[PDB]
Ligand binder design. Structure first.
Ligand code: HEM
Ligand SMILES: c1ccc(-n2ccnc2)cc1
Ligand SMILES: [Mg+2]
Length: 374
């Protein structure tokens, strides 16, 4: 019986083995330790994201009316000016790995890459990608964890202290002479509010991007004919990005607190309680997608022309008026790296005896990705 916990070691070894069980027999799955309900079905999940008056949310600031419009119109104008930067970042970061013909896309290249991109977005110095990459974890670990050793929380708090002490001077600096980056622009609306937006944009643009790339490569390689497809026609890359997003969404839950007494699915839920949209479940629901547990970049129901917008078929960006602002931007970013990886690592295989693993419950990705090449 689904009394089973979606927070168990058992579940984290493989979320996809239990989604059917859930959306079919306990589609509004209640949790014991947290006082929250886990929503399994597609059309429920979609309705939740579509209605934020009833289902409020908060921003990823936590322990240290809409402005997204200007943020989105930054990312739309900026997207052009960042393309050679995103391009250089990839080329540069791969440079040390080409001689050996061997690499770990998650741990040698991925995280570092995602960081430098966000840094260009915020116009920071890429000499500091390490400090920033490390601090970024600490805060993120805080958000993503169910519990923390007093050490880890002591450590996350530090990362946070450290980050704002780094960014805040830069805000004053640009407040008085802007440039063509986000921080400069957000200053043209309080000092500390700008710190919050930046921070949010730092956590949001960073965690998922590295993750998806690895995922896409992995599943491309695991279906080598589909790989060869993308090798011979590169306009395929988006469908390939998109189908990875549905298959194995990097962000796995999207919270919503409840503004009222309300019902969706079987049980009647009460005021001020928070729910978790299970995105994996939704994108593996037979009711939205045909042969849902099959990776196919060529699926007729992906809806590619809509895959990266406010009203897409898959939901790894969320859905509606409150979806990931950097969808346009993410698209291009992953598009660019993918092509660069594909170009530089001629004949990519998976490493002999490479056994594959995913870790994450709130955000999920490969632990590592051992590819070999020419
Ligand atoms: C790898 C691709 C990406 C995925 C899968 C992804 C996913 C998501 C999801 C699930 C949300 C929550 C949506 C909701 O509230 O329903 C979100 C929000 C957001 N995304 Fe992304 N995202 C991606 C890339 C990016 C990029 C490149 C940016 C660059 C600006 C970005 C900026 C944001 C921001 C600012 C939020 C607002 C959340 C908040 O702080 O209130 N995302 N994204
Ligand atoms: C930690 C937890 C969630 C996220 N996140 C939120 C929206 N897109 C990614 C980023 C870092
Ligand atoms: Mg089909």
């Amino acid at each position: 019986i689904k009394l089973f916990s979606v927070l168990s070691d058992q579940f984290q070894n493989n979320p996809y083995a239990y989604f059917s069980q859930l959306r079919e027999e306990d589609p509004v799955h209640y949790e014991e330790s947290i006082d929250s309900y886990f929503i399994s079905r597609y059309h429920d999940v979609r309705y939740i994201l579509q209605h934020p008056d009833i289902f409020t949310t908060k921003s990823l600031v936590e322990r240290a009316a809409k402005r997204r419009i200007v943020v989105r119109s930054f990312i739309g104008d900026a997207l052009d000016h960042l393309s050679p930067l995103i391009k250089q970042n990839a080329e540069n970061l791969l440079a040390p790995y080409l001689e050996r013909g061997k690499s770990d896309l998650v741990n040698d290249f991925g995280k570092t890459f995602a960081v430098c991109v966000t840094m260009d977005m915020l116009g920071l110095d890429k000499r500091d990608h390490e400090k920033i990459s490390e601090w970024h974890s600490g805060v993120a670990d805080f958000i993503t964890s169910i519990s923390q050793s007093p050490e880890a929380r002591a450590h996350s708090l530090w990362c946070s202290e450290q980050l704002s002490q780094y960014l805040m001077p830069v805000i004053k600096e640009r407040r008085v002479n802007p440039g063509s980056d986000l921080i400069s622009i957000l200053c043209t609306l309080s000092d500390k509010d700008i710190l919050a937006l930046i921070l949010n944009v730092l956590l949001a643009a960073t965690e998922p991007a590295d993750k998806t790339l690895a995922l896409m490569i992995y599943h491309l390689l695991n279906n080598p004919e589909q790989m060869n497809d993308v090798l011979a026609d590169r306009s395929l890359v988006p469908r390939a990005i998109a189908e990875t997003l549905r298959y194995k969404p990097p962000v796995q839950l999207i919270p919503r607190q409840l503004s009222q007494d309300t019902v969706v699915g079987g049980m009647e839920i009460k005021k001020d309680t928070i729910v978790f949209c299970m995105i994996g479940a939704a994108n593996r629901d037979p009711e939205a997608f045909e042969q849902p547990d099959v990776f196919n970049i060529h699926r007729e129901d992906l809806g590619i022309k809509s895959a990266f917008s406010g009203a897409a078929r898959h939901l790894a960006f969320g859905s509606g008026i409150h979806n990931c602002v950097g969808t346009a931007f993410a698209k291009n970013e992953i598009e660019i790296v993918a092509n660069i990886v594909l170009d530089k690592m001629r004949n990519i295989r998976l490493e002999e005896d490479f056994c594959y693993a995913e870790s994450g419950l709130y955000t999920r990705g490969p632990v590592s990705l051992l590819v070999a090449f020419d």
